[PDB]
Design a protein around this ligand. Structure first.
Ligand SMILES: CC(C)C[C@H](N)C(=O)NS(=O)(=O)OC[C@H]1O[C@@H](n2cnc3c(N)ncnc32)[C@H](O)[C@@H]1O
Ligand SMILES: [Mg+2]
Ligand SMILES: [Zn+2]
Length: 852
């Protein structure tokens, strides 16, 4: 054994040993319990950095722990390869997105190999390959014929100068980002998933997820946004019917989640496009100007809560079906058209938005809810004005005195009796828009035929292959300029037709890739039946909180869709979820990378500390750290600097500390083997061992219990490492030179290197092979010796009134109440008490009990 730790030598040799043994290339082995551990797969956008590395190190730690405990572990890796990264590089470096992507994949794959993650590379997928995306095309066509995928007109941002569709994130202040031209709202046919048909299932199945962070479940619930409410119709007053045609001539319909306050309604508000607004804006140019200002604002919810809420009265009136009140209709800019009825009632006394609107225009406030004895000034708003759980109805006639749910059901009964309303469930969830007017994405498997319509491509003809020899330039979708792509024949009638040239939202690839890893070469379906049955669901998913809503909701949706298609038999894709904290790093600037600065030879300006990312160019390349210190130093530093969920500050001094600890561990094993070579590790009955060696074994086995619980239950790796460090401090303070000393030392060292192998497997593999000839992964996770934890019993003096009357043998863990009990039953005490009770019993732990 070499004296000094050389990671540049031992880390390649350890990786070759694992690769050659194929320990991470797994099959559907029924004779082994499965464990599927998944980290969110990266975009192949150029280089991984230490942030990605923390995520994948967490996943590898968990995989290697399960591997040591006998599991058949699948830890797969792949490339989320479609999307806007490569298209933007295509406009920059004037290169094809495919070539840019495959080159980043090659570079990034070697980044991962050199960190030594226990990954089944035979299961690698790249989502931009036909062998992959043909199956999301297949599922698309199967859902399209069921109506689960459908075609309908939707709104898009059309940039008239750049001649392309823009994402909302690229429309700044009404105009295009890279052009400043005023953006047009256009209606174009697009494709949607009818995810609203699964809202209740997607909401209710969250309850099954007993091992998810409650915050992630809460965010999904809020996104789905189910509400139980009440449709309510207000009769159009007789003087207010001009210009109105149809049912709009008879009533104004709204949805409320507070029908228990319908008696508190003092006006009603309609959207600018509501037929009452347009009818009242007939002879009214100011209503016309308000309606126009509305249509030119941003309906995005981000602007909505941060916008000043305005309105104009319409001179039209409707009637409250409960108390007969005539209420004016207002046009208001916060009421959205297309979101249900496009009209709301307003109860200013019990809804904050309505209170501010009514305080602006001096509209009435009518109290219908009292929360206890609380004071109500119609002038100030109070948090309890909206209290739904502790209020009771006032000024409501028949309904005086009921709580929220009772009044809700009573209003339901009264309104249905009058045909004026009915219960109704709504969701804020909208359908999922698939269409993207972009080149670098999965083609939509639809052919447009003038006689047949929108025809799905037959399964035999899938995939619809995306041509890779394309260099986009942002001048609109290149697929729409390639007749050799879009010109085709109709699959139904054989006539001339045209392919759809839009491509799919790239969230579609990440919505089922975790099933594809189960059989990434299956040619007859998305996932084979045999492998889906074996691997079941993902046991452990690790990714950042930025994907806690859309990505996770989409994946759960696809799982149900695939289950409904008969392809898998789980309801939920991910059993456990770990949301790792962000690695953050100081930035510098024209943004300069930390590895190229020092504190041209000229200085830079040192700016703030933020999430590591290419946006501010503050990603530390792991290859730089590995060349300097080794993969194990990088892994150890990540796992030790912070609990995995807390943010982690990049730190030069943290890297050095990790490296010193690995030199320490190397030194410990070398100095041990220097003093006499490997022996059989201590095992069995420890009677006869010296106190110091018993104490070292107690430390050892309690360290084994605490590490197993930190990896397995707590998933807190920093404290597991800190625990192994304490064992070595105890070790260092123990004279292990005797024959029994060497055997305990061997036991300690054999346990430490296995306990740390999930964190730093290169050094631990190497040290283990110097200690013990067996394969580390067949020796398995260290076991806890319960006897090693039993401390020694102590003898206690039993005094009756201060005079010694006996002795008791008591356990080292014994409480004051056990001592009191054992003392009271001692034959010598019981005799010298003469049936008299105790006035007091003084317990001195470890020394004496004195009965008064
Ligand atoms: C399933 C699919 C939608 C995933 C999608 N392809 C994707 O997001 N790819 S990715 O390359 O941006 O990120 C991959 C993982 O790496 C984490 N990560 C990134 N930066 C940091 C950081 N500074 N600190 C810590 N972790 C970080 C990040 O959260 C994610 O889990
Ligand atoms: Mg359960
Ligand atoms: Zn046809």
């Amino acid at each position: 054994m070499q004296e000094h730790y050389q990671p540049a030598a031992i880390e390649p040799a350890a990786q070759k040993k694992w690769d050659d043994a194929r320990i991470s290339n797994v099959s559907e082995d029924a004779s082994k319990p499965k464990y599927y551990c998944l980290s969110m797969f990266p975009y192949p956008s150029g280089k991984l950095h230490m942030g990605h590395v923390r995520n994948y190190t967490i996943g590898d730690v968990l995989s290697r722990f399960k591997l040591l405990n006998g599991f058949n572990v699948m830890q797969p890796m792949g490339w989320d390869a479609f999307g806007m990264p490569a298209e933007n590089a295509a406009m920059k470096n004037n290169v094809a997105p495919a070539a840019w992507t495959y080159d980043n994949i090659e570079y990034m794959k070697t980044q991962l190999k050199s960190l030594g993650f226990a990954v089944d590379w035979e299961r690698e997928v790249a989502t931009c390959k036909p062998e992959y995306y043909r199956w999301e095309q297949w599922l698309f066509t199967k859902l399209f014929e069921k109506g689960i995928v459908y075609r309908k007109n939707g709104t898009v941002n059309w940039d008239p100068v750049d001649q392309t569709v823009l994402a909302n994130e690229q429309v700044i202040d009404g105009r295009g980002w890279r052009s400043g031209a005023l953006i047009e709202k256009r209606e174009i046919p697009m494709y949607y998933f009818k995810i609203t048909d699964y809202a209740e299932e997607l909401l209710n199945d969250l309850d099954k997820l007993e091992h998810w962070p409650e915050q992630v479940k809460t965010m999904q619930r809020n996104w789905i946004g189910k509400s139980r409410g009440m449709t309510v119709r207000f009769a159009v007053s007789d003087d207010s019917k001009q210009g109105l045609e149809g049912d709009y001539a008879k009533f104004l319909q709204v949805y409320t989640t507070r029908p228990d306050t319908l008696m508190g309604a003092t006006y009603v508000a309609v959207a600018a496009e509501h037929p009452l607004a347009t009818a009242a804006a007939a002879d009214k140019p100011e209503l016309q100007a308000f309606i126009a200002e509305c249509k030119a604002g941003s309906v995005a919810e981000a602007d909505m809560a941060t916008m000043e809420k305005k309105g104009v009265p319409t001179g039209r009136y409707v009637v409250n079906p409960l108390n007969g009140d005539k209420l004016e209709v207002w046009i208001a800019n916060y009421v959205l058209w297309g979101y249900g009825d496009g009209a709301v009632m307003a109860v200013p006394a019990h809804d904050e938005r309505d209170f501010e609107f009514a305080a602006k225009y001096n509209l009435p406030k009518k109290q219908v809810i009292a929360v206890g004895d609380n004071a109500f000034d119609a002038n100030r708003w109070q948090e309890w004005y909206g209290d739904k759980e502790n209020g009771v109805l006032v000024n409501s006639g028949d309904l005086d005195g009921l709580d929220f749910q009772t009044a809700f059901d009573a209003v339901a009964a009264k309104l249905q009796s009058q045909g004026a309303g009915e219960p109704k469930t709504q969701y804020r969830l909208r359908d999922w828009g698939i269409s993207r007017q972009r080149y670098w994405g999965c083609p939509i498997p639809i052919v447009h035929c003038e006689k047949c319509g929108n025809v799905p491509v037959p399964a035999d003809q899938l995939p619809v292959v995306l041509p890779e020899n394309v260099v986009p330039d942002g001048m609109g979708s290149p697929l729409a300029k390639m007749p050799e792509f879009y010109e085709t024949s109709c699959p139904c009638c054989g006539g001339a037709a045209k392919r759809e040239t839009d491509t799919m939202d790239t969230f579609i690839e990440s919505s089922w890739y975790f099933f594809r890893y189960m059989s990434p070469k299956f040619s007859d379906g998305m996932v084979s039946a045999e492998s889906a049955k074996y691997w079941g669901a993902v046991d452990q998913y690790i990714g950042g909180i930025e994907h806690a809503i859309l990505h996770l909701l989409y994946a759960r949706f696809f799982t149900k869709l695939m289950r409904d298609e008969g392809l898998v038999n789980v309801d939920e894709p991910f059993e456990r979820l770990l949301t790792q904290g962000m690695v953050v790093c100081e930035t510098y600037y024209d943004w300069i990378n930390p590895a190229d600065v020092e504190l041209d030879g000229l200085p830079v300006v040192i700016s703030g500390t933020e999430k590591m990312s290419k946006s501010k160019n503050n990603g530390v390349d792991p290859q730089e750290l590995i060349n300097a210190y080794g993969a194990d130093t990088a892994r150890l530093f990540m796992m030790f600097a912070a609990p995995p969920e807390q943010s982690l500050e990049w730190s030069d001094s943290g890297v050095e500390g990790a490296h010193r600890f690995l030199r320490r561990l190397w030194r410990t094993v070398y100095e041990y083997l220097k003093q006499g070579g490997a022996v059989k590790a201590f095992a069995g009955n420890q009677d006869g061992l010296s106190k110091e060696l018993k104490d070292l074994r107690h430390k050892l086995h309690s360290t084994t219990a605490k590490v197993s619980d930190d990896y397995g239950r707590r998933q807190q790796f920093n404290t597991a490492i800190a625990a192994v460090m304490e064992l070595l401090n105890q070790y260092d303070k123990t004279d292990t030179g005797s024959e029994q000393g060497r055997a305990v030392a061997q036991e300690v060292l054999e346990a430490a290197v296995r306990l740390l192998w999930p964190i730093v497997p290169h050094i631990c593999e190497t040290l283990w092979s110097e200690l013990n000839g067996a394969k580390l992964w067949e020796a398995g996770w260290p076991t806890v010796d319960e006897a090693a934890l039993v401390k020694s019993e102590i003898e206690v003096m039993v005094q009756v009134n201060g005079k010694l009357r006996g002795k008791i043998t008591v356990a080292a863990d014994a409480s004051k109440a056990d001592l009191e009990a054992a003392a009271l039953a001692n034959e010598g005490a019981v005799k010298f008490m003469e049936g008299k009770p105790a006035k007091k019993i003084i317990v001195v732990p470890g020394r004496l009990v004195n009965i008064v």
